[PDB]
Every structure is written in structure tokens, then in C-alpha cells.
Amino acid sequence: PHRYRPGTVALREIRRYQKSTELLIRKLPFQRLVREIAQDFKTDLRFQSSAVMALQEASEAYLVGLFEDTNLAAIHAKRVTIMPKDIQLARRIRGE
Amino acid sequence: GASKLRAVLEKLKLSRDDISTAAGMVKGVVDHLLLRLKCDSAFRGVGLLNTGSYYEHVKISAPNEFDVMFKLEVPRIQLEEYSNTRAYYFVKFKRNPKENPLSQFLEGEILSASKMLSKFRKIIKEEINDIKDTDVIMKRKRGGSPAVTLLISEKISVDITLALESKSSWPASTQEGLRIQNWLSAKVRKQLRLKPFYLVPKHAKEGNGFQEETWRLSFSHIEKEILNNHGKSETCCENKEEKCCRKDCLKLMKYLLEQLKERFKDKKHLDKFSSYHVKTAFFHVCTQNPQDSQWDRKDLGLCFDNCVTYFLQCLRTEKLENYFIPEFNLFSSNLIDKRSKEFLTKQIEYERNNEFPVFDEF
Amino acid sequence: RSRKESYSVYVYKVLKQVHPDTGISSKAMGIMNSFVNDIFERIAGEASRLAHYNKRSTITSREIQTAVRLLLPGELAKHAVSEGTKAVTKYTSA
Amino acid sequence: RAKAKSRSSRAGLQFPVGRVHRLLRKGNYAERVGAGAPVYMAAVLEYLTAEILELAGNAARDNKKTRIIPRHLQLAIRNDEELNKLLGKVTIAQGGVLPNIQAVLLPK
Amino acid sequence: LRDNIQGITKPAIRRLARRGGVKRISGLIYEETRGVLKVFLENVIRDAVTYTEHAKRKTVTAMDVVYALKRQGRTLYGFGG
Amino acid sequence: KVLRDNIQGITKPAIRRLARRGGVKRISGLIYEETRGVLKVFLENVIRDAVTYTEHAKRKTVTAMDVVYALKRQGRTLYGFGG
Ligand SMILES: [Zn+2]
């Protein structure tokens, strides 16, 4: 019954995801999210597949940058676990 | 003609089975030295080039003579050729925002070979005096290719070369070098050129003088890779089915020169010749004879004779192109005088006409 | 057919001077094209302002130079200035 | 007519000069473009292009490659402090991020 | 085509967090993250729609997305530009 | 004549007053130095751009507009001193 301890795997995933470039969010789901938002402005709207990808990459890039700052806030707070408030602080400082 | 040569080759290898302890003493000294260099702000990033080894024997007949290289990374460099020498350059640094710790060796824009070598041996000197179990004495420096020569007890000498490492694409002057395309293949050539090249502190030796802060291009790591990957099959010689005599011929060529240099070390005719000249000629002969069947082990006798002939031709015509830097003539009259070449030519021809007696006499 | 412009050909050439033995993916090229158009617009945009601010109808090598100093940071800005200053000096001398 | 010659070659540049001269008059940025304006600019664009490609090329070599991919551009830009800033707001398609892991997250 | 914010799977969220260097994630993050992602998308998509509409089109192109992102201090390279 | 150490011209009460306006109740002794090292960077960036604009215009005296452009370039606009 071999196991790897808590944090060993978490660090591993961090390593890998920092390294790789691929999209982490599933595509059909993301695409639909875009549309649901879009339909609130306008029905019968269309997207190029490249437009959806462009949105997805920007969206992930945004969240990752947000998570980096969130992580720093949690560390500042002497904590490894990030909480909703750490996100909120980072955003606020950024002017949101 | 191969049988006598085989006995020599076996003899030369076997003389090194005793070395493991000598290599140990060298390692002891080197590891010790690297700690100090790592403490020094200028050499903090220093390490061995031939990773995994504390020994590399340039001379086949000198098992007690060691050669090691200490490399130092230079993250971006601009080379400026010195006076059309083709192999010697001034080293300057490119834009680098952060502090570059090698700044202390700068002289104006140029990285001073003189300062680095002077300080390199100064650091090692102070540090060897902290080697307590082994007696290590430093030699006074003369040239710049070996930065430091260490004398270990009464048997072992160690030549230490300092080299800058650059991971940029090789300079255009190397574009036509590493002429292995017809020998080891164009694809090996391409693979090797994705690797770094090195620069060793070296004054621009010339007709009647020299430049103090020049650096010379070095591909010693490639030379090692080639010697151990001398076949276009690339595993040729790691299996007896594919045993060629390239490596054997080179050892014999090195041995011939070394034996003659020892023989005539007193007449000084041969002091300026080295295994590198032999090795360069050798790579060219391999280039001239790219097929393993032109090096069948059974033909060591004739293969070696043909290798010798090419080397003799190089001596006589005063031409030996650097294998990596084709415009760099190692046998130029500016580096080696004709007398030495005629003498070596004559001595080799004598040896060859008498089945190389110098191979047995000592 | 309609036709599109890019710097793909010029990017290749530059790559050869820095790395004669390497190539570039179509994406990296697309990125370099996005890059060039971005920098161009900024410099031209700032140069536009300088011409306006200083009451001119013309952009000269100076407006380009100043725009470079304002947009680029530290030393990177400098090499761009050195090369530009030279290129003009040279162009009229070549 | 005298023989026509390309200006990029003339200025010692690879980047087009006549075109930049032109592009500088578009978007309505200035009524007029001076003769030295595009020459100065073409040199700048080429310089910056070289810096990115060189650093990216080094990244390609670090990864034992014979070419630049979007990732190498990202690594190059970010590792170089001044380019990191020039393009500090730029999102690179498939750039990924630098492998920066906070020390406090690591065990002994 | 409803609450497609739930199409953003939990692992998908965690992986982004990991890429950002996040080692541990509170159980309340998933929802909070969504409340932020959604706003981001809303701002970008809407501008893209605005540009699309201005141009009298129905299909949003990569360029319309690029303009939308651009102006928020976010040039995106790779889709043209 | 050359000037120097006017970073100290930003006195302790001055830093505290700024901090207080910002809602800061209690200030660690090391803040003073830390704050100055940040103020300084801000000033360096704005002044430099103002100078750069001034030099472009081939003037010696820096005007309000040169400062305004400098601040706008850094993205912090200022009203009432020109525009
Ligand atoms: Zn072989």
C-alpha cells in the first residue's frame, strides 16, 4: 500500500502545469460558457473557432495570473491553502 | 605490419591500469580546488568540462600526466577576430542588464585573459597549500593553454585548462569546420553543433609577437565525443564485429610522436609538436578514409602507415587545418618552424623504414 | 485573390544572423508578426503625439528616437536608439 | 533609367525601408513622414526582433531543438528583464509560464 | 445552454491554480473562481460583440476578440494582430 | 551646486501623514525607509519622462505639460495643471 504524502503530488502538478502550454479547460464546456454569456447580449450570434480559442487562452492566462497573486496573498497570510478572500484581496489591489 | 603494433597498443593501455590511485590523487586535488573557486566571486560557477571524470590523458605514453578542464559559463559573448588570425578573438560581453560577476576581469569592453589566468592560478595556489594529505606544488606559468600545472609528489603532473563556455550558435568561421559530413555524417555534425563551444584564454601567438587578451576557440568536448564516436555506425568498436583501427592508428600516431619527442626532447626539435597536431591530421585522414573498411582492424599496419604518410605530408607542406576552424593552420610557419617539421619528417621516415623501433626501446 | 502582408520573410533573415542553423514554427512566426505590428504602432503612435505636441506635420528620426526612449526601458532602449541614429546617418551615406 | 536598388540592403538593414516610410503615414499618425524616420524605425524593429529570436534560439538549443516555437519566445521574453517588461502585458499563445515554485511550499 | 460555468470542471480550475503555483485549494474557491472568470469573459466578449456589431457582422472573429482584449492592457499574440 | 540626501526631505511626519490618509493606523519603524525607496522610484520614472519630453522639445525648463505627459505615460493622469 505505497502512497505519496500530501504535497508531493501537489508540487508535481505545479511543476508540470507550469511547464506545459496546452489548454487546461475542456473545450466544448468553455465554448458553451462563451455562448451562454454571449446570448445575454445577443441571440443567434456566431464565433470562429479561432475566436473561441483566443478567448480561452486569454481567460486561462487571466486566471493563472490571478492565482499567482492569490498564492502570494495566502503566503503573506502564512498559509498554503488559498481562500476566496485571497482572490478578493489580489483583485482589489489590482483595481477591481 | 599489424602484429607489432598490436603488442604496442596493448602495452600502452595496460600501463594505465596502475593509474586509478594517481587519478584518485588528482580528483582529491581537483574537488578541493573547485570548492575554493566556488567561494570566489569570479569562479563561483566553475565546474569540470569532462563531467564524470577527473582525468583525461592527452599523451598516450604519459599515464602519469593528467589534463583537466575547468569551465566557466559566459551567458552572452561577442567575439571580435584578432588581426585575421581566424582562431583568436577578443571576448566582449553583450548587453546584460543584471550584474555580471566577471566584470572584475574586464578591461574596457574586453574580458581579460591575463587577469583571469593570473587570478585563476592565484586562487589555486592558495588553495593547494590547504591540501594536507597530498603534497601539491604549483609550477610557474609560461603559456596560457594550461593555466596551471600542478606537481603531485614526485610522479604526477596535472595540467589545468580554464575555458569559457558559450551556448550560442557557433561563429560563422566554424561553419565549414567539423568536416565529418563524409565521415561520421552530416546529421552527427548537425547534432554536435547544437551543443556549446568553448573559449580558452590564449594570447594571439603570431609571427614575432602576440596579443595579450585574445581567446581561442576550443572544441575539446567534441574531439572527445568524436574519439568515442569515431564511426558513422557510431557503435563501431563497442562490438568486435565492427572493430576498426581508427582509434588504434591515432594511439600509434600519438605514440610515434611522443616517443620521438622523448627521444629528441634534448635536441628540442620537437618541443612544439603535440598530440593535437597528430589528432587533427588523424581526423583529416578519417575524413579522407570515411569507411570503416578502410580501417579494418586487420589492416592496422597499412592504415597506420597511411595515417603516417598523411601526417608526413602535412609536415612537409607546412599545412594542417584545424579540424573545426579550417582557416586556422596549425602547421603554419608562425607556430612551428620548418626545421622541426623536417626533423620530425626525417625521424618518422627513419622509424618507418625500420618498422618503428622507437616503439620498443623505452 | 486578395493579398496579405507580413514580416515573415524578414524574421527568417534575422533568425539567420543570430542562429544560422535554426528554423521557426508557423506559430512562432505568427507571434513575431503580432509583435512587430504592436511595436510599430506604439512607436508610430508616440511619434504622432510628439509631432502634435511640438506642433509639427512631420515625423522625423527624432520623433522616432524619442518614442523609442519613452517606450523601451533601460538599455534595450539605447541600442535601438544607437542603431536608428546610425541607420539614418548611414542611409544618406550609402 | 538608373538601376533600381533595394533600400533595406542600402541601409544595411533586412527590414523594408520604403514600406515603413509608408506605414508611418497611415492610421493618420502624422501628415508627413521624414526621410530618416523609417530608416531609424526599421533599424529598431529589426534590432528588437533579433534580440527576441536570439534568446529564443538559445531556448531552442536548451531544449535540443533546431527551431523556435511559441514557448521559446515566452521563455526568452520573460527571462530577459527588459523584454519581460516591454511585453509584460502580452499574452503569448501557448507560451506557458516560468517554472517558479515558492520555497515555502517545498519540504526540507 | 445554461449555467455553463459548471462546465468548467473542478480539476480544470485546480490545474489553473496549480499552474499559478497554488498548492492547496479551499473548498470554497471553485465558486469564487467562477464569479471572477465570468466577469472577465463578460467584459471581453461584450467588447468583441460591440466591435462585431459596429462592423455589421454576426460572426465574431479572432480580430474582434483581440481588440477586446487589447484595450484592457492585454495584447494577445498568435491570432493575427 | 549639486544637491544630495533630500530623500530625507521627506520627513517622518510626512510619511506618517500620507500613511494616515491612506487609513494606516500604526506604522513600523522600518516603513519610513521602505516607503522612501518606493517613492523614489515613482519620482524617478515621472521626472525622467518629463525630462525626456523636455529634451525632445529642446528646452531646459520643465513645464507642467511635460510632467503631465510623463504621468499620463505611466498611466496616472493628473487634472488641473493642464490638458
Ligand atoms: Zn571503430
User: With helix as H, strand as E and coil as C, how does chain B read?
Assistant: CHHHHHHHHHHHHHCCCCCHHHHHHHHHHHHHHHHHHHHCCCCCCCEECCCCCCCCCCCCCCCCEEEEEEEEECCCEEEEECCCCCCEEEEEECCCCCCCHHHHHEECCEECHHHHHHHHHHHHHHHHCCCCCCCEEECCCCCCCCCEEEEECCCEEEEEEEEEEECCCCCHHHCCCCCCHHHHHHHHHHHHCCCCEEEEECCCCECCECCCCEEEEECHHHHHHHHHCCCCCCCCCCCHHHCECHHHHHHHHHHHHHHHHHHCCCCCCCCCCCHHHHHHHHHHHHHHCCCHHHHEHHHHHHHHHHHHHHHHHHHHHCCCECCCCCCCECCCCCCCCHHHHHHHHHHHHHHHHCCCHHHCCC
D3 vs E71: CA distance, rounded Å? 46
Neighbouring chains of C at 3+ CB pairs under 8 Å are: B, D, E, F
How far apart are alpha carbons B244 and B227 in whole angstroms?
Answer: 12
Taking the C-alpha atoms of residue B42 and residue B105, their distance in angstroms, rounded to an integer, is 8
Please, what sign has the CA dihedral across residues E37, E39, E45, E47? negative
How many distinct structural domains can be found in chain F? 1
As to burial, measured by CB atoms within 10 angstroms (0-12 exposed, 13-18 middle, 19+ buried), residue B100 is: middle
Q: Which of B97, B98, B167 sits opposite D61 (nearest CB)?
A: B167
Q: How far apart are CA E22 and CA D97, in angstroms?
A: 13
All three cell numbers of E21: 503555483
Q: Domain residues for F83?
A: 1-83
Amino acid at site B15: S
Q: Which of F44, F52, F53, F66 to mutate to test the interface with C (most CBs of C within 10 A)?
A: F53
B234 CA distance to ligand 1 centroid (A)?
Answer: 8
**Per-residue b/e over B186-198, b at no fewer than 16 CB within 10 Å?**
eebbeebbbebbb
Shortest Cα distance, chain A CAs vs residue E20, angstroms? 5
- From D32, D37, D53, residue closest to C18, measured CB to CB: D53
Measured distance between the N- and C-terminal CA atoms of chain D, rounded to whole angstroms: 78
Closest residue in chain C to residue D17, using alpha carbons only: C91
Measured CA to CA, the distance from residue D49 to residue D33 in angstroms comes to 23
Nearest in space to B283 (alpha carbons), one of B189, B347, B211: B189
Distance CA A90, CA A72 (A): 9
The rounded distance, in Å, linking the Cα atoms of B357 and C4 is 76
Residue in the block written with cell 542603431? C83
Q: Which residue has the cell 530618416?
A: D36
State which H helix or E strand residue A15 sits in.
Answer: helix A8-19
Q: Is B57 annotated as a binding residue?
A: no
Bridge partners, B77 (sequence order): B93
Q: Which domain holds residue D37?
A: 1-107
Residue B317 labelled as part of a binding site: no
Burial of D92 (0-12, 13-18, 19+ CB in 10 A): buried
How would you label C22-34 residue by residue, b for 16+ Cβ within 10 Å and e otherwise? bbbbebbbbbbbb
Q: Is F26 left (phi over 0), alpha (psi -120 to 50) or beta?
A: beta
Q: How far is CA B264 from CA B38, B261, B273, B351, in A?
A: 42, 5, 12, 13
CB contact under 8 A, D85 and C91: no
Rounded Cα–Cα distance for residues B230 and B237 (Å): 9
Four-residue CA torsion sign, C49, C55, C61, C62: negative
- State the cell numbers at B10: 596493448
Question: Which chain A residues touch E30 with a CB distance below 8 Å?
Answer: none
The set of cell numbers assigned to B355 is 618498422
Strand partners of residue B244: B296
C-alpha cell, B187: 546529421
| Cα–Cα distance, C63 to C37 (Å, whole number) | 18
Q: How far is B24 from B155, CA to CA, in rounded Å?
A: 13
How many angstroms separate the Cα of B48 from the Cα of each of A83, B30, B161, B219? Answer: 48, 9, 10, 15
If you compute the radius of gyration of chain A from its CA atoms, what whole number of angstroms results?
Answer: 17
Alpha helix (H) residue ranges in chain C: 8-18, 26-53, 61-71, 76-91
Distance of alpha carbon C83 from the chain centroid? 11
Which among E4, E9, E13, E19 is the top mutation candidate for probing chain A, defined by the most A β-carbons within 10 Å of its own β-carbon?
E19
Instruction: Name the amino acid, one letter, at B26.
Output: V
Q: Which of D91, D100, D104 sits opposite A75 (nearest CB)?
A: D104
State how beta strands B106-107 and B88-93 pair: unpaired
Q: How far is the CA of E81 from the centre of ligand 1 (A)?
A: 55
Would you call A15 an interface residue with chain D, using a CB distance cutoff of 8 Å?
yes
Q: How far is CA D108 from CA A8, B83, D105, in A?
A: 12, 55, 10
Cα of first residue to Cα of last residue in chain B, in angstroms, is 20
Could you tell me the CATH number of the domain that includes residue F55?
Answer: 1.10.20.10
Cα separation values, B252 from B60, B239, B301, B340, F22, Å: 9, 21, 10, 20, 83
Taking the centre of ligand 1 as the mean of its atom positions, its distance from the CA of residue B187, in whole angstroms, is 18
Strands B148-152 and B136-138: antiparallel
Half-sphere exposure for F48 (CA within 13 Å, toward CB) = 13
Domain span at C27: 1-94
Give the CA radius of gyration of chain D. 19
Q: For residues B236 and C87, give the distance between their C-alpha atoms in angstroms, rounded to a whole number.
A: 54
Find, among B162, D8, D107, the residue nearest to A10 by Cα: D107
F83 SS3 class: coil
Backbone φ and ψ of D65, nearest 5° = -115, 170
The phi, psi pair for B361, rounded to 5°, reads: -80, -15
DSSP bridge partners of B149: B159
Interface test with C, best of B93, B95, B174 (most C CBs within 10 A): B95
Chains that touch E (3 or more CB pairs under 8 A): A, C, D
Residue D14: its H or E element = none
| CATH at D100 | 1.10.20.10
CB B58 within 8 A of CB B50: no
Q: How many CB atoms lie within 10 A of CB B321?
A: 20
Non-local (6+) Cβ contacts of E20 within 8 A are: A63, A64, A65, A66, A67, A68, A70, A71, D97
Cell of D4: 533600381
Report which of B55, B62, B73, B215 is spatially closest to residue B145, judged by C-alpha positions. Answer: B215
- Structural domain count, chain D: 1
Count of alpha carbons within 13 angstroms of residue C48, beta-carbon side:
15
Q: For residue C35, list chain E residues with Cβ-Cβ distance below 8 A.
A: 77, 81
Q: Give the Cα separation of F70 and F78 in Å (integer).
A: 10
At residue F80, what is the residue type? G
> In terms of Cα–Cα distance, which of B352, B348, B336 is closest to B269?
B336
The answer to whether the CB of C36 falls within 8 A of the CB of D45 is yes
d(CA E66, CA A51): 9
In contact, B229 and B188? CB cutoff 8 Å: yes
Q: How far apart are CA C74 and CA B95, in angstroms?
A: 11
Q: How many CA atoms lie within 13 A of A38 on its CB side?
A: 25
| Technique behind the model | cryo-EM
Measured in angstroms, the CA of E72 and the nearest CA of chain D are apart by 10
Find all residues with CB under 8 Å of B331, minimum gap 6, and list them: B277, B314, B315, B318, B319, B320, B341
Strand D91-92 and strand E76-77: the pairing is parallel
Q: Which residues of E touch A10 (CB under 8 A)?
A: 18, 23-24
Distance (Å, whole) CA B301 – CA C83? 61
CATH number of residue C34's parent domain: 1.10.20.10
Chain C residues in contact with E74 (beta carbon < 8 A): none
Instruction: Decide: F and D in contact? Rule: 3+ Cβ pairs under 8 Å.
Output: no
Listing DSSP states for A46-86 in one string gives EE-HHHHHHHHHHHHHHHHHHHHHHHHHHHHTT-SEE-HHH
Question: What are the backbone dihedrals phi and psi of residue A37, each rounded to the nearest 5 degrees, phi first?
Answer: -65, -45
The ranges assigned to domains in chain B are: 1-14+170-196+219-362, 15-169+197-218
Tell whether C33 lies on the interface with E, counting CB pairs under 8 A.
yes
Query: Annotated binding residue at B311?
Result: no
Rounded Cα gap, residues C36 and B356, in angstroms: 68
Q: Resolution reached, in Å?
A: 4.1
* Own/partner long-range contacts of B346-354 (Cβ < 8 Å, ≥24 apart): B347/B260, B347/B263, B347/B264, B347/B270, B348/B256, B348/B260, B348/B308, B348/B311, B348/B312, B349/B312, B351/B256, B351/B260, B352/B305, B352/B308
Nearest chain E alpha carbon to D86: E75
Query: C55 phi and psi, to 5 degrees?
Result: 65, 60
CA dist D9 and C87 (Å) reads: 11
What is the rounded distance in angstroms from the CA atom of residue C73 to the CA atom of residue D81? 9
Q: Look-up: residue for cell 626545421?
A: B339
DSSP letter assigned to residue E28: T
Going by their DSSP bridges, the two strands B148-152 and B47-48 should be labelled as unpaired
Number of structural domains, chain C?
A: 1
CB-based contact B228:B256 (threshold 8 Å) = no
Q: CB count, 10 Å around CB of A45? A: 19
Torsion sign across C-alpha atoms D74, D80, D83, D87: positive
Report which DSSP code applies to D54: H
d(CA E51, CA A5): 51
Q: Is residue B95 within 8 Å of residue C74, measured between CB atoms?
A: no
